Design a protein around this ligand. Structure first.
Ligand SMILES: [Zn+2]
Length: 271
């Protein structure tokens, strides 16, 4: 029997993209019942997001400050549609409450909880299935932990780290994010360095903490020059992207008590 951790808000947004008018709460859970059946999910855990990441906002005050700007310039109809979605989502998460253990810790991101659960109980199962279209969740991939994106109807395994992410492992994917950047979450990257360039640098010099040791790096390229002055940016981004290493801190940032209850609840389910 396997473990299934769903990315609630993420799946919800997929139901929005398919249709912004029609409610989805019913299909949502049913779809999750189908997936659990297929992946012999003996245990199923639904997780959604609730608020900005307290842990991230600390190391980067402007973290995700771009998604706010986008809502500021939305018309009445747009903000309306947006509000609808979030309503239908709240309903969707309520429906789940009747079938699957659901969780929402305001101030903690979903990936932070999924990563904490994976660590905490991942060993109690034969496999762990992450249900998300978000490839950032691929930082949890192991030979016993895999992801499944509906948008592509494809499942992603560790061996697929290069084709899908331009890197070779979980540590390189973290270093690439920290070096490259992440527009979607509004995280500044080394100006001039992208996926292909970032990889090559990593392949030749190693992970971030290894590249910091070697700065300045040889080369007369501007991105190689920009790199040599991003040390501060690198240390920062690394914390924001290194999910498996900072997930316990990310949750504890909202209370040594909230972390305790969530720990108790998980194991109280994986038993
Ligand atoms: Zn997420």
């Amino acid at each position: 029997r396997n473990l299934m951790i769903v990315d609630g808000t993420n799946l919800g947004f997929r139901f929005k993209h398919n249709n912004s008018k029609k409610p989805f709460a019913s299909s949502y859970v049913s779809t999750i019942q189908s997936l659990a059946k297929s992946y012999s999910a003996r245990t199923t855990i639904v997780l959604g997001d609730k608020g900005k990441s307290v842990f991230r906002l600390e190391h980067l005050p402007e973290y995700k400050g771009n998604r706010d700007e986008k809502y500021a310039q939305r018309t009445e109809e747009e903000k309306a549609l947006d509000e609808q979605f979030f309503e239908y989502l709240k309903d969707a998460f309520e429906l789940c409450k009747t079938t699957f253990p659901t969780f929402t810790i305001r101030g903690v991101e979903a990936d932070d909880m999924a990563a904490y659960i994976v660590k905490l109980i991942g060993h109690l199962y034969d496999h762990v299935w992450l249900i998300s279209t978000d490839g950032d969740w691929d930082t949890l991939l192991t030979d016993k932990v895999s992801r499944f994106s509906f948008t592509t109807r494809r499942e992603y395994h560790l061996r697929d780290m290069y084709e899908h992410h331009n890197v070779d492992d979980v540590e390189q994917f973290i270093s690439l994010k920290a070096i490259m950047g992440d527009l979607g979450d509004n995280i500044r990257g080394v100006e001039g360095i992208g996926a292909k360039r970032g990889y090559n640098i990593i392949r030749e010099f190693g992970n971030v903490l290894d590249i910091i040791d070697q700065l300045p790096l040889p080369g007369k390229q501007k991105y190689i020059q920009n790199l040599n002055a991003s040390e501060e940016l690198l240390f920062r981004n690394l914390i924001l992207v290194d999910l498996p290493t900072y997930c316990v801190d990310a949750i504890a940032a909202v209370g040594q008590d909230v972390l305790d209850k969530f720990t108790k609840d998980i194991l109280e389910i994986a038993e």
